[PDB]
């Protein structure tokens with residue numbers, strides 16, 4: 001599924017991500033834009049052989065099991081494939097654990113490099129929320 005900007009903002013709000021760990025909804029929409037272009041089926045292989053999955057590009061190194069990332073953990077207790085669902089519940093649940101891990105949204109390097117410090121409210125501008 002390829003979400004629209006306000007459609008994803010609504011889905012993230014419904015799943016309690018808005019102001020989670022102090023991150024406003026535009027921060028989460030911005031991170032999703034640059035991680036996946038709002039595509040739930042986005043996958044990207046890392047140089048270290050881990051893979052990133054779904055709207056928030058969650059990494060098999062730590063967070064989900066894909067069976068092909070040696071030495072990795074599965075701290076969200078999910079198959080990485082669940083992060084590719086049209087239903088964002090698994091991605092949201094796992095993103096809440098990631099953003100609680102101690103470095104906040106810096107865990108998402110695209111958030112640090114493209115969202116952090118910017119006018120992230122622009123991402124939810126005009127959305128009925």
Ligand code: NA
Pocket residue numbers: 060061062063064065066067069072073074
């Ligand atoms: Na893993």
